[PDB]
């Protein structure tokens, strides 16, 4: 990627996956790869987008 | 016969007959209690923003 920006649409600290973050990116190649959070701050739903 | 309560009533009431009742007396205020179930609360991202 290059020049990617993350905004939080929904944010509710519920027990399920209750938060929506829409990452506005600009990619050189169009292909799937993996997202991850290193901390224990958030737990992502899917492994790749 | 001093005139009826239809013409002399304070706050602009409207006295009627067959049940003895007054109408539309603009006085006081009605409080309200809403016990709303949790199903009606739609999430944020299902509405425009």
Distances (CA, A) of B24 to A34, B5, B13: 67, 14, 6
Return the SS3 of A34. strand
Alpha carbon of A5: minimum distance to chain B alpha carbons (Å): 19
H or E stretch covering B7: helix B5-8
Deposited experimental method: cryo-EM
Which of A7, A9, A16 to mutate: most B Cβ within 10 Å? A9
Q: Do A9 and B43 touch (CB under 8 A)?
A: no
Alpha carbon of B46: minimum distance to chain A alpha carbons (Å): 10
Decide the pairing of beta strands A5-11 and A19-24.
antiparallel
Q: Are B4 and B17 in contact (CB under 8 A)?
A: no
């Amino acid at each position: 990627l290059s020049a990617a920006e993350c905004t939080l649409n929904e944010c509710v600290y519920s027990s399920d996956f209750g938060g929506i973050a829409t990452v506005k990116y600009s990619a050189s190649k169009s292909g799937k790869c993996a997202v991850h959070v290193p901390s224990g701050t958030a737990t992502l739903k899917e492994a790749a987008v | 016969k001093a005139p009826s309560l239809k013409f002399t009533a304070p706050f602009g009431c409207e006295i009627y007959t067959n049940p003895i009742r007054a109408e539309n007396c603009a006085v006081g205020s009605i409080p309200l209690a809403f016990d709303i179930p949790d199903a009606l609360f739609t999430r944020v991202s299902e509405t425009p923003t």
